[model samples]
Target: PDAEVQKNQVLTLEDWKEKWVTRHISFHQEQGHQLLKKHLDTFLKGQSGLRVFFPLCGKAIEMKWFADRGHTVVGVEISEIGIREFFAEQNLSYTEEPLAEIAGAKVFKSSSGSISLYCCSIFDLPRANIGKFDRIWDRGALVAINPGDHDRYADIILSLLRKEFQYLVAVLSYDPTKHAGPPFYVPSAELKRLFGTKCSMQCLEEVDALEERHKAWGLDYLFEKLYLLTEK
Candidate 1:
């Protein structure tokens, strides 16, 4: 299922689409990211009944985590397989209805109404439809984006947030000379440069994230960084 990516070679958009179509080896964690849960309160304190957003969301069980905490979880993912798999695996019932704002999009809502998944391109997601969110969680989405798309992607992210917003972004950065990525390297400096125009960035933690499994991807070292972003 792994793509034939050579060291120092990045996957093209067409390659990404191929991976998506085949449900290629997505390195999804069984549970929500560990660091997210570990430092969740550090960013979420004093926040309750929040409206949370997830971009490029792929049936991440983490959506349910926030929902369980009394927040409304809204996610945008292009793949319907991930969406369907989530509900089936969880054995949860959901109702589907068209997303009126985006012609081809649909919203899958849980029976309890705590979680909603919008199957569409993140670019096509309208703020008018989902309303403003108080919090945004980026689990490697920024780094996962094609290098050329970061500018617009960040712009869309900021637009979805209300005047007051809190963002928790988790990213992996490493020496690119050793390997290329869909999980690409994102320098902490770039995070500041991109989001600093509208938000104050705080580096919550940075530590070695290298694991035995990553060696298979030709990465010898990986550093995981977490940041909290608040409106400037």
Candidate 2:
């Protein structure tokens, strides 16, 4: 069913929850993402204690990476199971409290209060409660949502940014005619259109990400592009 939803490019909140329940998401990296590691200094620019936001952060170890480095880390995840597992895997003790601003949402905070994972839809996150962020690490977020909601998603992300901010986003580009995806293909031009008006965008890196499995899936080429967007 998740594969069907991915093929059709239609994913509901329930579909995402089901993926978490079944642990069917293949993109989970226990060691955190290499892109963030490679570009951390460039993105931070010698900043510390900065607020970092991770959109649709599904137990991503990158949150732990930032938290361990003394930055305030925040994430939005729809699945409670994933949230619980994140703290457990990281061996961090946390307490949960209902998020009064949003219905059916709860926030899990690290014992030290430096990390908070809001178990809710990204669209439902209240900006007033989470406040603005100095940086946003969007490794697997932008391309994971339905293409129809890209505008809304982008709007939420931009609105959450503080006056000075660095947003590092990882996007995948593939021959969409050959493959449909939850990890959807986002062209660079489309990213420019989506965020260019508000931020200055720069392509930091591009690499051929085509692997044997991707080739077997009928994809002739797969490329991962990293962009750094800063307030202009």
Candidate 3:
């Protein structure tokens, strides 16, 4: 069944859960995480200890690797369901606290640094609350939101990071040849327009991303991008 989100409307955390919280979505994500791991070795090159942020971080396994590296990992998640699953699956102990939502949230602590999963909106995140992240791990968040908000996304990221360093590994899909949606095809030109000067965009690596899961959406291909936006 297809979700009927208004064409011009912004989605809520509850809205996404209703649409993408499925076996297919979960399995495909697990698959994508595995594939990215292979490419990550190439992306990181010879990087060391750093604080990282995973935006819209759902039930992902990638964060575990970051924590294993002795890097502090912070994940901003809207849906509490994803947060619950992440901790449960990781077999970590966490405590629940009241947040913007009455249901509250859970932030698991372990030897692999702290994994704070927020029960809040990614767009409304404050810098003081988010702290300084040295790196970024983004997956399907951008693709799952309204394309018009791309500029806002960049602004928020810059605010949270505050010119204080770390690499950003973002995966955006594009096929100028097709229609757009939550998985809207973000073009290179648009990337330049949105984040070019603010963040020095580098083509870390652009490869043909597997789109077997998004075949129904007319997705032809995806540009899995890794970027290094430095002070230079």
Candidate 4:
């Protein structure tokens, strides 16, 4: 990500976005969405209309779930191609809006009015620009990069935290063979180093090698670290 993968290659961040934007409307990742929704439903059982922020959310269906719950969902992705492709596939159509804070990126305003996705790098996002959120979900955002950047990602989370919000869950998994990462091998101990301090993290749930979503990827197992993060 520090350097470009190619002039036009899927491995690059921009190329990935173009693919997802198009992928969103045409094909749905049912397994991932269902599993994610289950987590969201369980975590937000009593709460409704919570503000949510998703990083590298390439037309993820989970955003729809948040929006349906009356929560305002703000998502950021690095690809413009993906955003355009998503609208094209949904047949819902979207009008581009200038996001001056995020230079050169555009906001995808959905016709259904369920979401607002920003075309920007996740690392570049700020609460002032993207608004506040009650819950922040990271299914496959940080893992996309190397482990050393984990702290950088956590710093962004710290910047986003406030007294009003409580839960910050990261479903992190890794396969050293088939894929290097965004699905990196961030072990529980390593996680302690990345997010262990400053927040009261109670990993309420964890799973190894989720069957429903990641079977095809040949991932041995993926663990989700759920936390009731609190400010100390």
Which candidate wins on TM-score? 2
TM-score of each: 0.88, 0.93, 0.78, 0.74
Q: Which candidate comes out best when scored by lDDT?
A: 2
> 16-35, model 2: which lDDT tens digit per residue?
99998998877788788877
RMSD from true fold, candidate 4 = 5.5
lDDT of 1 by residue, 107-156 (tens): 89999999899888777886437888999999857777776667788888
Show model 4 residue runs off by greater than 4 Å: 1-28, 88-93, 111-114, 173-179, 210-228
**What overall lDDT goes with each candidate model?**
0.79, 0.87, 0.63, 0.63
Q: List pairs with backbone clashes in candidate 3.
A: 134-166, 143-182
Ranking by TM-score: 2, 1, 3, 4
lDDT of candidate 3 at residue 118, scale 0 to 100: 70
Question: How far off is residue 186 in model 4, in Å?
Answer: 1.6
Residues 1-232 of candidate 4: C-alpha lDDT, one tens digit per residue: 3122221221455546555545532233544554455566666879887878777676666776677678877777787766665566545666778877767767887776567788777676772276567777766665554555667878887677656666555556555565444456555565566667866676766656466556667766666665556665
Stretches of model 3 off by over 4 angstroms after superposition: 1-10, 20-28, 31-36, 39-48, 100-113, 162-164, 176-180
Better of 1 and 3 by lDDT: 1
Q: How do the residues 1-232 of candidate 3 rate in per-residue lDDT, one tens digit apiece? A: 0222324546556777665465334422554464458666754557776777887787777877877766677887776677778888778767765654323443444534467777666775663266777677666665565665777877776766746464554556555345446555555566677667767777666777666765655776666775566544
Task: Report lDDT (Cα) of residue 181, candidate 3.
Answer: 60
| Ten residues in sequence with the least summed lDDT for candidate 3 | 1-10
